[PDB]
Design a protein around this ligand. Structure first.
Ligand code: MG
Ligand code: MG
Ligand code: MG
Ligand code: MG
Ligand code: MG
Ligand code: MG
Ligand code: MG
Ligand code: MG
Ligand code: MG
Ligand code: MG
Ligand code: MG
Ligand code: MG
Ligand code: MG
Ligand code: MG
Ligand code: MG
Ligand code: MG
Ligand code: MG
Ligand code: MG
Ligand code: MG
Ligand code: MG
Ligand code: MG
Ligand code: MG
Ligand code: MG
Ligand code: MG
Ligand code: MG
Ligand code: MG
Ligand code: MG
Ligand code: MG
Ligand code: MG
Ligand code: MG
Ligand code: MG
Ligand code: MG
Ligand code: MG
Ligand code: MG
Ligand code: MG
Ligand code: MG
Ligand code: MG
Ligand code: MG
Ligand code: MG
Ligand code: MG
Lengths: 136, 99, 126, 25, 84, 215, 64
RNA sequence: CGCAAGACGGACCAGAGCGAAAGCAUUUGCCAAGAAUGUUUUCAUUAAUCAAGAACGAAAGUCGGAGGUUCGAAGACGAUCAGAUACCGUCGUAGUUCCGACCAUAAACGAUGCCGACUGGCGAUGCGGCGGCGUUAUUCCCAUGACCCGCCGGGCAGCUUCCGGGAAACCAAAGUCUUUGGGUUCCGGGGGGAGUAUGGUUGCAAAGCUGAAACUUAAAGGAAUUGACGGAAGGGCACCACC
């Protein structure tokens, strides 16, 4: 197991890119630049019903599997960037968002700075559904 | 017959106001008819604050909030119980409900 | 459950207290006999309920007065306080004093002594 | 809405009858 | 609305609160004033709501500025309201 | 890439910050080491690191994220340079609120050096200490004057300075601290932030200039 | 996926949850560090003071 | 991490502003226009309302160019269901965007013509003007800008009540009406047949404007009240309810 050859005094930070949506959740750990990635675990790898892919239990199951690989490779701390689907769509974090984030703290990893990174338009293209909306 | 003096809309001295999309419905409702609500919640939680305020590598780290402006259908807001019915004499009270 | 008394019991107990206030005490087995001898209750269960509410009212009349029963002992302590008392005196110091635009008013009806002044910041909330 | 649908069906029938009357004439 | 107000003999001050025309007999709110430039020395007579630029003669080559209401004097000292 | 556990073919590096920042050890990155035709320095250059200002200056606020672009590697070390400035969502959201006037402006300016910068600026009117009315709205001409006075300052202080000398003013944001004062005779305006700085055009490398920024 | 068992003591009964009112919201501490507390939905007749056994203590109850 | 394209101008954004209405929201410049306010300026009845006639007139639609990101009639599939040519899902043509011509209709609504006069109170609000203490900034200053406390014009509205009105709902106008007359344009006469047939006129088309009758019928309709019902909301309840 090779990692950054110092971790006893200072931590080694990363970024976690939690994307939580009303159909699914991702947990995705990259390096400090974002360009080189490490393990990425998704809610549908950790359940066998489509309706459960966006559920807090699938979210924490994923956060544990991510934190284990992160601790195993070289990483001891994380920064958090939190995503809803954003522009033209739901703009609110899905149900899995609060559970993955706290299953990182209950798994050994240390937390840094938390941000929301939801894409927001200065004004949009036209939203799906026609002028009477999805009526059912 | 005429249920509201203001026709259930805030328009006065205007022809037109720009429509907007009902946030869950995707409907098409005038900006001054839609039901607005500005939510300001903690990003982390109210219960799971201890598990994070303890793991933070910063001693005094204040957790950020999450500001969202929601626009609602009339039907879509009645169905999520954001609003309810009122008496014929109580519909005229326009104060925000006591905190 | 129940144990909520009825108006027929409460009104009876209130009258019994408002007339025979000085015969009633704090124990139940004596109030029972008192109400048995002063009134005519045509049942024994009703007698016990009335005598049990009388005790619960008596335990309260020893504190501040209730607002449905009027007795003589608790009226004097009102009457003798509604007449003047040395806690009050006259107008507390008879050198009371005013501000301008009142002296300007008093001047228009010929007043000339024993006052003061002050001027405020020039408008509300400053 | 029976009103505007009545309107549309009557418009359709009138267009058809006018086009026939013009063609055969 | 005292139900018995007197319209013929109004107040000496509540008749200057009203509009210039809604009062019993019309009267302008404007006036004429003597103005002194502190430089040259004349007695220029200026309308209060000037709306023009006034000069004295030569010298300061300004004496008032126009506005949306009453004209303002630059530093024209001692200005007197003329009378009736 | 499905070589044997491809994280065992990666090498780690250090990320250094420019000489102005008090803390100069940003962190670490990993790159697949050099092979027959894919060089590591190439696949390592051109990276952007977004670092909070607290994690670099150690003495001030937590917002005002900075962006740092990797320029040239030197033996297990990455030499970064300024690439842009920004603010955090929560601050910008907590500033925009009802019954106020929000005034925005933007300019494009050059630094005597070849760096062409695209600066944005924001401000908000201020309820007075004894106000009783509910709104602090400004008229149109007042907003136009404030925008003019904001753009003029935001250009004055970048036309006259090197790239290093301007970044040193962005660190504590004295630009906003003087716009707040300049616009006090128009409308109180209890906020000025240079909420963004974009890097549009930059001249050729000239490693001698980079090494001055690290000495 | 590998977690030991956790005994938890009940310190408050909140209300009856579920469609038929068939289970109870209950607040518990963790028998090791009393400074911890979670909310669970219990199936049986729970009093205050009982000790529950948790096969999965990293979860929390929302409702229903 | 960059590149390109075509849409769209969020949060600030309000019972707030402007315009004859339809409508109008990123910065900067230019072009002409406009209401209100201030005026001891000027002309001197020059005005109000309006057949004929005229300008503008959301969306959709038609003709000829450019472009085509997103969304999406028609259409093709996947579901749901007795059926499902629908509601839900994945695509997708015309269209949606700009220019040059047409079309002239909307629950185009304040379902309320325009001009003028009179009849209660209150607190706010956008514009202009006037007066007055005190805070605040520059230049220490006078000016002025932000607040503060009032007054006057006219503007979008609100609360209030035995002005008064009305079938009432409600309305400071829908009031000043059997105590009926300030001026003027449009327009209705039980419900259908029917905005139909036919003639005329306009348009490339779709269609717009004008517009009956035979026949048929005792009601159609408005406001409010009391029940019953609701796949409406709130609070409770029963092993003839469930767990
Ligand atoms: Mg689509
Ligand atoms: Mg529905
Ligand atoms: Mg109805
Ligand atoms: Mg309209
Ligand atoms: Mg406006
Ligand atoms: Mg904008
Ligand atoms: Mg006219
Ligand atoms: Mg005509
Ligand atoms: Mg059109
Ligand atoms: Mg079109
Ligand atoms: Mg044509
Ligand atoms: Mg075409
Ligand atoms: Mg079809
Ligand atoms: Mg089908
Ligand atoms: Mg069916
Ligand atoms: Mg159905
Ligand atoms: Mg479909
Ligand atoms: Mg599509
Ligand atoms: Mg048309
Ligand atoms: Mg025309
Ligand atoms: Mg019409
Ligand atoms: Mg009409
Ligand atoms: Mg009138
Ligand atoms: Mg006003
Ligand atoms: Mg004013
Ligand atoms: Mg003034
Ligand atoms: Mg001004
Ligand atoms: Mg108007
Ligand atoms: Mg009014
Ligand atoms: Mg009228
Ligand atoms: Mg009249
Ligand atoms: Mg008829
Ligand atoms: Mg007709
Ligand atoms: Mg015809
Ligand atoms: Mg009959
Ligand atoms: Mg009815
Ligand atoms: Mg009814
Ligand atoms: Mg209910
Ligand atoms: Mg029971
Ligand atoms: Mg059973």
């Amino acid at each position: 197991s090779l990692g950054p050859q110092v971790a006893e005094g200072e931590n080694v930070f990363g970024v976690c890119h939690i994307f939580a949506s009303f159909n699914d959740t991702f947990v995705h750990v990259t390096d400090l630049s974002g360009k080189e990635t490490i393990c990425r675990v998704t809610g549908g790898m950790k359940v066998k019903a489509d309706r459960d892919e966006s559920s807090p239990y699938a979210a924490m199951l994923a956060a544990q599997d991510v934190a284990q690989r992160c601790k195993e490779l070289g990483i001891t701390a994380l920064h958090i960037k939190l995503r809803a689907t954003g522009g033209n769509r739901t703009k609110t974090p899905g149900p899995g968002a609060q559970s993955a984030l706290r299953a990182l703290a209950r798994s050994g990893m240390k937390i840094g700075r938390i941000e929301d990174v939801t894409p927001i338009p200065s004004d949009s293209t036209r939203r799906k559904g026609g002028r009477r909306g999805r009526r059912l | 017959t005429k249920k509201r003096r203001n026709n259930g809309r805030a328009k006065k001295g205007r022809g037109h106001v720009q429509p907007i999309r009902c946030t869950n419905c995707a409907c098409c409702v005038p900006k001054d008819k839609a039901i607005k609500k500005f939510v300001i919640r903690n990003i982390v939680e109210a219960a799971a604050v201890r598990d994070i305020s303890e793991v933070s590598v910063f001693d005094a780290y204040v957790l950020p909030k999450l500001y969202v402006k929601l626009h609602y259908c009339v039907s879509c807001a009645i169905h999520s119980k954001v609003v309810r019915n009122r008496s014929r004499e109580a519909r005229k009270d326009r104060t925000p409900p006591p905190r | 459950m129940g144990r909520v008394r009825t108006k027929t019991v409460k009104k009876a107990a209130r009258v019994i207290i408002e007339k025979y206030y000085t015969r009633l005490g704090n124990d139940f087995h004596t109030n029972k006999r008192v109400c048995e001898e002063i009134a005519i209750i045509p049942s024994k269960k009703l007698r016990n309920k009335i005598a049990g509410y009388v005790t619960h009212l008596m335990k309260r009349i020893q504190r501040g007065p209730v607002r449905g029963i009027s007795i003589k002992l608790q009226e004097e302590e009102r009457e003798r306080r509604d007449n003047y008392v040395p806690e009050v005196s006259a107008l507390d110091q008879e050198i009371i004093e005013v501000d301008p635009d009142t002296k300007e008013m008093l001047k228009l009806l010929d007043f000339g002594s024993l006052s003061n002044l002050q001027v405020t910041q020039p408008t509300v909330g400053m | 809405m029976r009103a505007k649908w009545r309107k549309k069906r009557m418009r359709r029938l009138k267009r058809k009858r006018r086009k026939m009357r013009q063609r055969s004439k | 609305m005292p139900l018995a107000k007197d319209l013929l003999h109004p107040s000496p001050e509540e008749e200057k609160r009203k509009h210039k025309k809604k009062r019993l007999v019309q009267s302008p709110n404007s006036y004429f004033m003597d103005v002194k430039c502190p430089g040259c020395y004349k007695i220029t007579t200026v309308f209060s709501h000037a709306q023009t630029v006034v000069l004295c003669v030569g010298c300061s080559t300004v004496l008032c500025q126009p506005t949306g209401g009453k004209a303002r004097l630059t530093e024209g000292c001692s200005f007197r309201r003329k009378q009736h | 890439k499905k070589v044997v556990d491809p994280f065992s073919k990666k090498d780690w590096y250090d990320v250094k910050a420019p000489a102005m920042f008090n803390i100069r050890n940003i962190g670490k990155t990993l790159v697949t080491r050099t092979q027959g035709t894919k060089i590591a320095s190439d696949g390592l250059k051109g990276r952007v690191f977004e670092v909070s200002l607290a994690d670099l200056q150690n003495d001030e606020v937590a917002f005002r994220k900075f962006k740092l672009i990797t320029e040239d590697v030197q033996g297990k070390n990455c030499l970064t340079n300024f690439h842009g400035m920004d603010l955090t969502r929560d601050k910008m959201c907590s500033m925009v609120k009802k019954w106020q006037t929000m005034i925005e402006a933007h300019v494009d300016v050059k630094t005597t050096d070849g760096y062409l910068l695209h600066l944005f600026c924001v401000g908000f009117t201020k309820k007075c200490n004894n106000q009783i009315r509910k709104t602090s709205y400004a008229q149109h001409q007042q907003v136009r004057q404030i925008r003019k006075k904001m753009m003029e300052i935001m250009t004055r202080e970048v036309q006259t300075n090197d790239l290093k000398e301007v970044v040193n003013k962005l660190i504590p944001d004295s630009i906003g601290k003087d716009i707040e004062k300049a616009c006090q005779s128009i409308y109180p305006l209890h906020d000025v932030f240079v909420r963004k700085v974009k890097m549009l055009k930059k001249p050729k490398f000239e490693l001698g200039k980079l090494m001055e920024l690290h000495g | 996926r590998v977690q030991p068992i956790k005994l938890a003591r009940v310190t408050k009964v909140l209300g009856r949850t579920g469609s038929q009112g068939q289970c109870t919201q209950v607040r518990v501490e963790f028998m090791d560090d009393t400074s911890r507390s979670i909310i669970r939905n219990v199936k049986g007749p729970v009093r205050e003071g009982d000790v529950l056994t948790l096969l999965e203590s990293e979860r929390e109850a929302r409702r229903l």
